[PDB]
Design a protein around this ligand. Sequence first.
Ligand code: UDP
Ligand code: UDP
Lengths: 453, 453
Amino acid sequence: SCPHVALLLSSGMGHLTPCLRFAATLVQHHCRVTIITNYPTVSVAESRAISLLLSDFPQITEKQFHLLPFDPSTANTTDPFFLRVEAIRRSAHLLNPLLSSISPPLSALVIDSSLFSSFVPVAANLDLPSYVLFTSSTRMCSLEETFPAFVASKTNFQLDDVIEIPGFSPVPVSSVPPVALNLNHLFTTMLIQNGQSFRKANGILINTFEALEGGILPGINDKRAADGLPPYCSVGPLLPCKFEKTECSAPVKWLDDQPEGSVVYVSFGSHFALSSEQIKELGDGLIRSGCRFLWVVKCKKVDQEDEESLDELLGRDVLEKIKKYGFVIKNWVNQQEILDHRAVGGFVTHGGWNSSMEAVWHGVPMLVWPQFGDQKINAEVIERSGLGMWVKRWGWGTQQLVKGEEIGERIKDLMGNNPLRVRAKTLREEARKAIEVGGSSEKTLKELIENWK
Amino acid sequence: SCPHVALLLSSGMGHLTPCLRFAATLVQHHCRVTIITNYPTVSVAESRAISLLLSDFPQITEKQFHLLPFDPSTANTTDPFFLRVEAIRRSAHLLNPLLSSISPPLSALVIDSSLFSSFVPVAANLDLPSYVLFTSSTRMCSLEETFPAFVASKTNFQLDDVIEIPGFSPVPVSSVPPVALNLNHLFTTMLIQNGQSFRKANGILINTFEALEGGILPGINDKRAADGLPPYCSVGPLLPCKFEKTECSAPVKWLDDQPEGSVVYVSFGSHFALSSEQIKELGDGLIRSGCRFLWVVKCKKVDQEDEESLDELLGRDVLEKIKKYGFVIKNWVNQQEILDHRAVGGFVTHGGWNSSMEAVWHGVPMLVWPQFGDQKINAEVIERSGLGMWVKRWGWGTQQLVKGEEIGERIKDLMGNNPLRVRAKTLREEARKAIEVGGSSEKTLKELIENWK
Ligand SMILES: O=c1ccn([C@@H]2O[C@H](COP(=O)(O)OP(=O)(O)O)[C@@H](O)[C@H]2O)c(=O)[nH]1
Ligand SMILES: O=c1ccn([C@@H]2O[C@H](COP(=O)(O)OP(=O)(O)O)[C@@H](O)[C@H]2O)c(=O)[nH]1
């Protein structure tokens, strides 16, 4: 009796990363796994990740969801990931026969959150227990669920008031994703409809553990069952795969020739790329901070289109000036393996929940510097844990520039902030004890498989 | 449905390795796998490999079989592996409560060839399809089955005649494990009692593929069905795991700067350790040959006891002289990855079946130098395959010393041997096609899972 579970992927490495890690988890919990992929992906990272998963897990089946011919002329955004997600959403009627041909019979269809609204009827008509795979924080989930009612209660958008979130601290509209302020954006409509659609699920999966939220979960859950709402299933932290660990990289070699806790890791996810001026000021601040640093740089959103050098950005002598203090790279790195390194002492991040949870798992203090979307929300969550700190004065990264002096002076604070480390240890141990036998995530996930059965 | 299979292990690395790789393949074929381990292992590599397997495969449940207190005073051997196996066998009446507590219910109990005689009464008592995991050659299996009859026929041990083998070429007593020539020996009685109990199994798992035996296996199998005998289930080549290829190893870097097919690999497994005079003469022959080489060395049998250096044995100005010609190492290496390397041309082997099958899978010519045990059998099996070669004049390693001149002159022949290369290509392809869908071992293994069901 090994249950068969199918996964519905969208696009974006931020959504793609926890998917495969969850699939590997189910596989390592005696379940049969089929992933529903769609090509061609926006970024190469996605394809390579899929290929790696299928290579290290031959018992995982891949079914290509052939999409409809897409017309980008009717989507009010130029972000290729949102576009791809929409392209998948507008062919929801085509997943159904694809879902039918799957043998043995499925026991659960786990859909990416960004695709839920379009694809929750497909699971409903096939009598399959549908699950929301939420690739972000819990507070952000309650935010997405409460947001439609909020936009409903208003005639039109709206100072910096507060939208009431059940179970969590209220959310200032400064924390609400900037692109969701105008109601005509594709991501806005998607967010609203999906947020409305989450209640049509049999359970919501969130990459988290009960000790991280503050022990506020088991109350919220049976406070939701009274309303007839799907339970917040804590299955995190989702462990990194066995192929995400290449002990013989180039950044690792450098990291091994540095003292411990003295290197600041800086990476703003995979989707985002800083402006030129912000990059220059960031380098300046890095040099000023007086600390060692590993710096991951992007100049274009899609990695398949980022082919300019920092010689063409910063200049030649600037980059030649910065590389002597630390390590500068404009390539893909393995965040998990780097954050696990003993040398790394802190993480300057955008606040992406994947990188955040990766830092929580490896016990590394964070300086949250939001850029867009759910990040600010996450920035509070992290700060309520005691693992990270964030400068509210910096606001959004896409909206406000920060000059090098402040950057260096705050990094100097990050490398000297000891309670963040003392909290990092205990939190890493709690996170590890959460997935072990008799943990929060273990009992939750086992309770999930038990109903499948 | 996912058939819950159990595995039972013994001492030795040559026994442990195929158990683990087979458990891995089973897990990759939708079968729930439990492994039954016993500690402390004699060698460290066993523990390390077990931990690696359990780390990469958290779905593989581990069950420790707590053995009885063991008095080695009544055994007639000082070999720790044999003593370990025995120590396991004397606690056979305890695997029953161990097996009873296994959830979910079992579909099969795969047992090791050196443990069958003691533990197949258990399975039968629980009505469990018992299977022999045979870590050696098919012809060796037929030898172990035919042996007790041959020793019952004699009044007392005995020139160099032949002991007939049904389906294969005959076996001279010069090619029979020299320690089995005396009948009181613990390993001899173990051999006899095991080869007698193989018939009670529902099958005999073997690490080989039909195209290797010359396509002589089905004719033997339906001639075994007529005799009411379990079938020789060929499920090879049992593919190496994902944790056996560390791309950033010490000697792989060395090989990376060597011309392809120019390097002689030289190793005699884990268990065995050459003499002092033969290590010296081998070091002489490696230089005398004229070929680059990667020589792994063991001065003691158990790795956990070989702390002495080669400076003590060979000498300072001798080892320093040899390292100039080729890579010398007295430590555990990654044999599969080395044989996989482009720079490797051949393989001076002892004749162990794991090493042999790895060399087959990576298609590398072999110079078999039988040291003991079942290595002359396998020396013939491989010589007839057209992949390797073995000089009969050298005899047993533990009996006859081969001086440097002969070793070098014969290694030169090994390197200059083209038919072994062509047959290496063709045999490696035939080895790959057997585990692919529709291949011999694929149909076999699938049939085995099918019956479970
Ligand atoms: O250079 C990089 C940049 C990104 N990541 C991975 O990308 C993920 C970041 O995803 P997240 O959702 O947190 O940020 P996003 O880019 O989606 O906004 C992390 O898991 C990292 O492992 C990486 O491995 N190397
Ligand atoms: O230095 C070494 C020596 C041995 N092996 C492994 O040990 C096995 C050899 O076992 P075999 O049965 O062929 O020889 P024996 O058991 O007699 O030692 C092979 O799979 C190798 O991968 C290894 O990895 N490194």
